[PDB]
Structures are given as C-alpha cells and as structure tokens.
Design a protein around this ligand. Sequence first.
Ligand SMILES: CCCCCCCCCCCCCC(=O)SCCNC(=O)CCNC(=O)[C@H](O)C(C)(C)COP(=O)(O)OP(=O)(O)OC[C@H]1O[C@@H](n2cnc3c(N)ncnc32)[C@H](O)[C@@H]1OP(=O)(O)O
Length: 411
Amino acid sequence: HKFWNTQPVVQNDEYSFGPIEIEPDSFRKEIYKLPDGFSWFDCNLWDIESQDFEDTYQLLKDHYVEQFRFNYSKEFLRWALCVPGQKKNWLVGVRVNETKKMVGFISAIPIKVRIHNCIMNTSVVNFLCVHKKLRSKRLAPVLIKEITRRIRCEKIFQSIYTCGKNITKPFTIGTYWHRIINVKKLLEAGFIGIPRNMTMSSLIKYHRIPADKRIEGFRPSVDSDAEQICKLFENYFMKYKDVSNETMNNLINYDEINHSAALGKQAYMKLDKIEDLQDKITIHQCFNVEDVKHYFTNIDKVIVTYVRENKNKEITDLFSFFIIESTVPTINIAYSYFNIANTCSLKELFNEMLITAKNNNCDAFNTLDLMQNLQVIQDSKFIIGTGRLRYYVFNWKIPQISPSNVGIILF
Ligand SMILES: CCCCCCCCCCCCCC(=O)SCCNC(=O)CCNC(=O)[C@H](O)C(C)(C)COP(=O)(O)OP(=O)(O)OC[C@H]1O[C@@H](n2cnc3c(N)ncnc32)[C@H](O)[C@@H]1OP(=O)(O)O
C-alpha cells in the first residue's frame, strides 16, 4: 500500500471508541489536480434524462465489477444517491476533456449513525469506479482524496464504506448467504447445479418457498406510514442497544464538538471486555421521518418495503429488500435491507419477504449475517456464500465486532 498507510484508519499492524484525529482545521482544501486532459464534474443525477446520468449508468454497467455484470438501473441509482440532505458536489465524475468520455466516478451520501454512546452525521462512500482501461494509472486514490475533501468541507470528518478486498483493518466482516427462488433460471444460467444425487425436479421442490403458513396483514408501505415506521425503528434500536437507557437518551452529538480537539475528546470511550457487546447493535443508521419516507418506499424493480398493520392501523412489523438487475440473460437479485419482526418470528417475516421477492420476479435473495439475520439463515435452506464484505470506518475507532453488532447496509 502506497495510499492507505497515510489515512486516519485502523491498520492491519483495541477495545475503545472515538475519533482517530480531531483535525477540524488542518486538512487540505485545494481541489486535487487531475492528469492532463481530465476534469472533474458534479454528476447531474437529479435529472434522470440527463447525459451525466447516461454516462454514469454506462460507466458503472460496463466497469463496476471485480463473466457477469451487475446493472444498476437509473431509477436505482437515483434512489441510492439522491437521498435527503444530499450535496450536489458529493456525486463526483471524471471525464476526458477531448472526448467528454466519463472515465471515473465516486459518491458519498449523508447518513445519521449511532456508534456506541455517540451520534453524528457522517458519510457513506460508494460506487467508486474507474474505466477498465485507466486502471493502474493510480486514479482511484485521487478520487478518494477528492471525495474526502468534499466531505470535510461539509464539516463531516468520518465515513463508512465496504469492500470485498481487505485493505486496512475492518471493524467487521459480513458474509452473504443466498436463498434460491427460481431454480430453472439459475440452473440454465450456470449459477447453480443439480446435485449428482438428485434430479432437477427434486431440486426445484427442495428450494420452493413454503407458502402453507401465511402471515395476514402485510402490505406495501406508503408515504403516510413514515411516522409509524420512524417510531418502529427507534424501538428496534432501543431493544438491541449496547449502551444504557440513559446513554441512549443522551447520546454524545459529535457534530456539536468536532470543531475542537478539546471538546471532541468527549467522544472517547473505553470498553472493559469486547464480549460485553455480544449480540447488541453497536453501530447503525438512524432514520428521521424524511429518511424513512425516502428509503422505506416502493419503487418497481428497485426497493420493496412491506409493513404489517394490526386491526387498529398500527404498524407492528416491517420487511424490506432492494433489487439489482444483473446480466451474465437477465437475473434479478433481491438483497435484504432492514427488517423488524415483532409479532411473528424472524424466519416467518423472511418467509413472507421471500414470497414477495418471488412475486417481484427475483431469482435469488441475498442476506448478510448482519443484525439478527443469523436466526434466519442458520439451519435453513440458505446457502453460505463466498463473498465476504469488509466494513470500514474512516477516522473513528471501533473494536473488531461481530456482524450481528452492525446495522448498516450499503447499496
Ligand atoms: C471524512 C471523509 C472521508 C471519505 C473517504 C473514505 C474512504 C473511501 C474509500 C473508497 C471506498 C470504496 C467503496 C466502493 O465503491 S466498493 C466497490 C469498489 N469498486 C469496484 O469494485 C468497481 C470495479 N473496480 C474499479 O473500478 C477499480 O478497480 C477501482 C476504482 C476499485 C480501483 O482502482 P484501480 O484498480 O484502477 O487502482 P489505482 O491504480 O487507480 O489505485 C490503487 C489504489 O487504490 C486502492 N484501491 C483499489 N480498490 C479499492 C477499493 N475498492 N476501495 C478502496 N481502495 C481501493 C489500492 O489499495 C490501492 O491503494 P494502495 O494499496 O496503494 O494504498
């Protein structure tokens, strides 16, 4: 490594929380120079008909992969990036001056997170992409340094991001598990096989989604549910919290003290034993009503959010998953988003979600072992994946924790 060694992240070479550096003042502000013939632009994902959007969609479709290609649609990208509070300058493009060919992208979105006894606005950096031909032209560190600069100028000094590769020391590692829905489609596409043991017909039967015990009262969310949903999440995070009740109701607001190395030191917290954290949520996204409205909605072939209503019009449960269309043949993959099971078991809620994914033409359903999802995927028909997702936080200390301690899902 000739870049990551110079950033405030935990290195491959503890048991406490808080900022790595409180450097409100001493960070670079001059926009970074690009190689001759390249220029930055703010990517206009606000107008779905724009040229910026076509170029971004094309760049990502052709080049965002470590075959098969994911195919983030334009509606998906607008949902995942034009979020409440988004800055125009956090959607960063690079183009060749002569041809106007988009050859790079990086994005950040603003989120609210709780980390142990602190709460803060932070950023999520995602969709880092360099045209296949310009790789090993050391362009990615520049996109990273530039998004960093644009985030710090908003007085945000931390970030969360994921990766397949191991870079520095991640605070947790998520593992994907996979539920097969459309056997025939996955078989013909070579994504799965027929166990030499059994026949195609039995394989299909083995992977059917059991629909012989159905939970009444689930329906898609609507805008007017947003306050009930906001409270539902607050109560879920209350139940699973890793701090006392008093700390939960009096979280250290880092936005208010991040301007001062004196005051910011308030955010440091030692941990007696890492096992004290066992199976509680330590870090998660926090949603206000505006956030709920945007994220927990329903957009065909992008995001599906169902709630359970009781006979008093009170929302008691929620499942949600997003959808990414892939091409090798068109394959639609659902991903588990956020799920709250209160009046049924988590397996039962997931069963209902899996049926809804099948009804939305999804061919498989992917779930990380985050939060409590291991209650679902242990001793089930889920198959463990090989894809392992490393979670990182920039400029904060988080002990290495189990994925069940993590309530953050990236797109
Ligand atoms: C306060 C705010 C702070 C905000 C900043 C928070 C940090 C954000 C971090 C970004 C979070 C990303 C979130 C997502 O989007 S996750 C998905 C990552 N993107 C892809 O998989 C798309 C397909 N791949 C590509 O487009 C390129 O290969 C990419 C762009 C990935 C690398 O480009 P390239 O292959 O042409 O190489 P280079 O010569 O230009 O540069 C080499 C340097 O780049 C480091 N590298 C390579 N890949 C990644 C990677 N996926 N994360 C972090 N670092 C990476 C590498 O260690 C090396 O550094 P070092 O070993 O010398 O030190």
